[PDB]
Amino acid sequence: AEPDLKTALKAVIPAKRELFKQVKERSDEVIGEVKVANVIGGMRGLKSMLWEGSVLDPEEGIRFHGKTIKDCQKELPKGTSGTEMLPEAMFWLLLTGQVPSTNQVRAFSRELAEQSHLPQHILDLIKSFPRSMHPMTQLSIAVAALNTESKFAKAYEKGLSKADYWEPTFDDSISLLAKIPRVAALVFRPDEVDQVGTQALDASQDWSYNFAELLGKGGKENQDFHDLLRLYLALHGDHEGGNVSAHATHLVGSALSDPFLSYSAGLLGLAGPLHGLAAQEVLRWILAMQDKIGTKFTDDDVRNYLWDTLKSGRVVPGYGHGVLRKPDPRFQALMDFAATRPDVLANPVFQLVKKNSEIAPAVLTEHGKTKNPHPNVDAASGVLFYHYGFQQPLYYTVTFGVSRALGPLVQLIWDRALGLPIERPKSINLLGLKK
Amino acid sequence: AEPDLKTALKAVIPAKRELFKQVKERSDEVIGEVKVANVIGGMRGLKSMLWEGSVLDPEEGIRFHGKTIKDCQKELPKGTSGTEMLPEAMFWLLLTGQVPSTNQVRAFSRELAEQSHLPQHILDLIKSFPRSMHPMTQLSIAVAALNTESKFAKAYEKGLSKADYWEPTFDDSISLLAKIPRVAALVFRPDEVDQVGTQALDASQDWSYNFAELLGKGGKENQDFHDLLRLYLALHGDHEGGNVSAHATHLVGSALSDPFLSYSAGLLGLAGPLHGLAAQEVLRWILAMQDKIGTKFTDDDVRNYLWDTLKSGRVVPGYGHGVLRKPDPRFQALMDFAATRPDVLANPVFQLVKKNSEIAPAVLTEHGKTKNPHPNVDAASGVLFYHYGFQQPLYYTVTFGVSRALGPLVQLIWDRALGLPIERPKSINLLGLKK
Ligand SMILES: CC(C)(COP(=O)(O)OP(=O)(O)OC[C@H]1O[C@@H](n2cnc3c(N)ncnc32)[C@H](O)[C@@H]1OP(=O)(O)O)[C@@H](O)C(=O)NCCC(=O)NCCS
Ligand SMILES: O=C([O-])CC(=O)C(=O)O
Numbered sequence: 094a095e096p097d098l099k100t101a102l103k104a105v106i107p108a109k110r111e112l113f114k115q116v117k118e119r120s121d122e123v124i125g126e127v128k129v130a131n132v133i134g135g136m137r138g139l140k141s142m143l144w145e146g147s148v149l150d151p152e153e154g155i156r157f158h159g160k161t162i163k164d165c166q167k168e169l170p171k172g173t174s175g176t177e178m179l180p181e182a183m184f185w186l187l188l189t190g191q192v193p194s195t196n197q198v199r200a201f202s203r204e205l206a207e208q209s210h211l212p213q214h215i216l217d218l219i220k221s222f223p224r225s226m227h228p229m230t231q232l233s234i235a236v237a238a239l240n241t242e243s244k245f246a247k248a249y250e251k252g253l254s255k256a257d258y259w260e261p262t263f264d265d266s267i268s269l270l271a272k273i274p275r276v277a278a279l280v281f282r283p284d285e286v287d288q289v290g291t292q293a294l295d296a297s298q299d300w301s302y303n304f305a306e307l308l309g310k311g312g313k314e315n316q317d318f319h320d321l322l323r324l325y326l327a328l329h330g331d332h333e334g335g336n337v338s339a340h341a342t343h344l345v346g347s348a349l350s351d352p353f354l355s356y357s358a359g360l361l362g363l364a365g366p367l368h369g370l371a372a373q374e375v376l377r378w379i380l381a382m383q384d385k386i387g388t389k390f391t392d393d394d395v396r397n398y399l400w401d402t403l404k405s406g407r408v409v410p411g412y413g414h415g416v417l418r419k420p421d422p423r424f425q426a427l428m429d430f431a432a433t434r435p436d437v438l439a440n441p442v443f444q445l446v447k448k449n450s451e452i453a454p455a456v457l458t459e460h461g462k463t464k465n466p467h468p469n470v471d472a473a474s475g476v477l478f479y480h481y482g483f484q485q486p487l488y489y490t491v492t493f494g495v496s497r498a499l500g501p502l503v504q505l506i507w508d509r510a511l512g513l514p515i516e517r518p519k520s521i522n523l524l525g526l527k528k
Numbered sequence: 529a530e531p532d533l534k535t536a537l538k539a540v541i542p543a544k545r546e547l548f549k550q551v552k553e554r555s556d557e558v559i560g561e562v563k564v565a566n567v568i569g570g571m572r573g574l575k576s577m578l579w580e581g582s583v584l585d586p587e588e589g590i591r592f593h594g595k596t597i598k599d600c601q602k603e604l605p606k607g608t609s610g611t612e613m614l615p616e617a618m619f620w621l622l623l624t625g626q627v628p629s630t631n632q633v634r635a636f637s638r639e640l641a642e643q644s645h646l647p648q649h650i651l652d653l654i655k656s657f658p659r660s661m662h663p664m665t666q667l668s669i670a671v672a673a674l675n676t677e678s679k680f681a682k683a684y685e686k687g688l689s690k691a692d693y694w695e696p697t698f699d700d701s702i703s704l705l706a707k708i709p710r711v712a713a714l715v716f717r718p719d720e721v722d723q724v725g726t727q728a729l730d731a732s733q734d735w736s737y738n739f740a741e742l743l744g745k746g747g748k749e750n751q752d753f754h755d756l757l758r759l760y761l762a763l764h765g766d767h768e769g770g771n772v773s774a775h776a777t778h779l780v781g782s783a784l785s786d787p788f789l790s791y792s793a794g795l796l797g798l799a800g801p802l803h804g805l806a807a808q809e810v811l812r813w814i815l816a817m818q819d820k821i822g823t824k825f826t827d828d829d830v831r832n833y834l835w836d837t838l839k840s841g842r843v844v845p846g847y848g849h850g851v852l853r854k855p856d857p858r859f860q861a862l863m864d865f866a867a868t869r870p871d872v873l874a875n876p877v878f879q880l881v882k883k884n885s886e887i888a889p890a891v892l893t894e895h896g897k898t899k900n901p902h903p904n905v906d907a908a909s910g911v912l913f914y915h916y917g918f919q920q921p922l923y924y925t926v927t928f929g930v931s932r933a934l935g936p937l938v939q940l941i942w943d944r945a946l947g948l949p950i951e952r953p954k955s956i957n958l959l960g961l962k963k
């Protein structure tokens with residue numbers, strides 16, 4: 094056997110700690126300014142937090158340990174079938190800063206299958222949800238409810254040494270990762286909780302495949318979607334630290350809440366319309382537009398629907414970003430996935446998304462409120478699930494929730510390993526800013 | 529009939545918006561520096577966020593709209609019985625910036641009783657929790673599950689103008705405030721869910737009274753505790769924006785998650801040992817000390833127990849603070865509550881807390897590690913509940929959760945009224961700080 098993930102982590106921990114010691118010697122160095130805009134504009138442009146596994150360039154998009162999406166697509170191991178990079182390999186990369194071998198990822202995928210089972214009480218809890226409860230509300234709750242399984246909480250409560258916080262944090266992160274797909278599947282399939290909640294995973298298969306199996310999309314006849322799902326989950330894993338869900342996870346984590354509670358809070362932030370609930374909102378908005386404009390439509394019909402949306406005092410979902418000033422390479426990667434599949438390009442809903450990406454930026458620029466008129470990844474993700482038969486847009490952000498566990502759980506482990514403190518900015522009132 | 533809370537808010541909204549417009553003209557003005565310490569040290573000392581209702585004074589401790597705790601104790605309306613300021617009146621003050629009349633508060637207390645009822649599903653959900661599930665995990669979950677009752681989420685989902693965000697946000701905040709005590713009581717009393725979950729509240733009684741009734745502590749014989757609970761909840765409502773629970777609520781709120789989801793995340797942050805658990809930790813530490821030193825003890829017995837605690841590499845809980853450099857006026861207010869109650873002063877556990885506050889600061893200073901050797905509010909809060917028969921310290925953070933809804937829900941309403949954007953800072957890795 095090659096080194097397992099935990100062993101791989103331990104090898105890189107001392108080097109990171111030494112680097113932390115060196116960065117700390119320069120604590121007093123000025124790296125920027127705070128202005129009034131930063132305070133009133135939700136900390137926009139303010140480099141104020143540490144995130145190790147990914148950094149976002151506004152012009153060029155995301156890099157994971159200095160590697161582009163395309164670099165990751167080429168370098169990360171693939172599944173037993175298919176052409177797309179595995180999220181579990183992305184997780185490995187994020188955590189260790191090193192690309193895993195295919196063997197190492199297979200061993201890791203196998204561990205994730207083994208640890209996906211849920212305690213009976215989580216099944217009972219999910220069964221208590223009324224049918225109408227929003228799916229992200231369900232997902233967030235069930236993840237927090239898994240804090241009964243937390244080794245970190247129990248170890249912290251028993252007395253535990255600061256240097257060894259990361260191990261329980263890591264154990265919990267792997268546990269949450271293994272379980273969350275199944276939880277997510279229970280949200281998708283409320284009538285089939287007893288079967289879905291206990292059904293065995295194929296032990297020889299990757300995370301995305303098993304997530305699809307639990308969704309009712311397993312086997313060879315669904316292998317194209319397995320590839321989409323793999324790509325999708327790996328693309329949404331991490332997008333630096335400033336995004337609401339990552340940040341919330343870190344923030345709640347910094348008070349030494351365990352990873353289930355911490356990432357529950359992530360999920361609550363991800364449920365925000367301005368954040369990941371945009372994936373849902375994009376496709377609902379696109380379907381509404383389709384109903385209004387019909388099968389045969391002009392550019393103006395699309396232009397008018399966007400302008401009407403803006404004039405209603407609503408956002409155009411799937412366009413804009415707190416950091417990016419160009420089209421999101423995650424968005425482009427999903428469009429390129431579509432580009433080689435003629436049945437997807439023929440899907441009228443996808444065509445509408447494509448057409449909308451050609452018109453929305455001009456309209457958004459004419460409106461002139463947004464810093465970034467370009468599409469983000471949420472513009473394209475939902476239409477792709479729709480194409481493969483996931484046609485209830487209320488569930489779309491749930492799949493994002495599974496993905497977005499990856500980066501933030503990585504960061505929590507590092508936060509505990511480094512001994513990073515509680516997150517505690519200073520606030521001030523408007524009268525205080527005026528003085 | 530005098531203006532209701534919503535009407536009182538509406539009168540002050542345009543003035544706040546005008547001030548916001550003026551502060552915005554000076555967006556480009558530099559108010560501070562970012563250093564490396566800020567990035568690695570959890571944004572400590574970094575003025576980066578807006579919080580309107582409370583500001584922390586280094587000499588004087590927290591002030592609510594410029595008013596001290598003692599100012600609030602004198603000016604805020606009291607209940608039909610008792611001498612302590614009502615939390616609902618604190619909420620009013622936080623929100624409106626003005627002290628309510630007793631009439632106005634009675635009308636508001638009546639609305640809170642009327643809206644405390646829960647959907648049947650919340651009862652079923654709470655019933656599903658295993659006995660061992662941590663109480664803060666229970667509280668956080670149930671609050672998030674109340675997002676089925678969210679007007680903001682349903683209005684947002686139906687299409688809603690940005691200008692109209694605050695009213696649904698306000699409606700939800702009042703709804704959450706009315707309901708949370710009952711939820712909190714269900715966590716305290718897992719065997720009494722059917723009774724506590726449905727019991728009608730006296731609409732002519734204040735929030736804290738009804739919370740006590742649901743706790744099993746109603747009626748004249750418990751009126752002292754009603755006063756404690758009132759004081760306690762009003763003191764813990766708000767403590768700037770930088771604290772984890774407030775911040776988390778704001779952060780998740782900024783992506784336009786409703787107040788149930790947003791404050792659920794607050795509660796998850798409050799569940800963190802470094803945030804919400806201190807009250808519990810103090811009393812366990814005090815009871816440990818009491819078991820060793822006994823009912824009759826000398827200063828030295830206490831001195832030795834503190835020195836032993838510090839030499840074991842542990843904190844003396846309830847002393848220190850991220851901001852405060854003086855004894856906390858919240859702490860002093862709780863000690864002064866005890867001062868007029870001879871049975872409390874006679875309680876050996878309270879005497880030990882008092883005695884410890886006379887000795888701990890010197891010892892902490894001699895040890896020399898801490899910046900702030902003075903007691904914070906957590907030093908005193910737990911012993912007082914213990915005196916009135918709440919002797920499971922595990923549930924003390926739950927009562928904090930009820931209190932800490934106040935300030936952050938206020939801030940959310942203001943965030944939506946002002947049109948504040950998503951909170952989305954820039955992050956950076958250690959390698960980026962090194963270069
Ligand atoms: C992503 C987003 C939340 C970023 O927020 P931000 O960084 O604060 O946005 P900006 O700095 O560009 O905001 C400046 C103004 O343009 C507006 N704006 C930005 N993007 C917009 C969009 N897609 N549609 C309408 N208005 C937008 C903002 O609301 C703000 O106006 P306001 O003062 O009237 O609120 C925002 O651009 C957006 O897209 N909102 C919709 C959510 C979405 O589609 N995707 C989220 C997943 S990345
Ligand atoms: O149409 C919806 O809103 C989703 C729905 O009925 C369900 O499956 O519960």
Ligand SMILES: O=C([O-])CC(=O)C(=O)O
Nearest residue numbers: 332335336337415469952
């Ligand atoms: O980066 C952001 O601000 C939000 C986002 O799209 C992501 O998390 O990928």
Ligand SMILES: O=C([O-])CC(=O)C(=O)O
Nearest residue numbers: 848849850897898899900
């Ligand atoms: O706990 C804290 O962050 C505050 C403190 O006592 C210190 O810095 O010495």
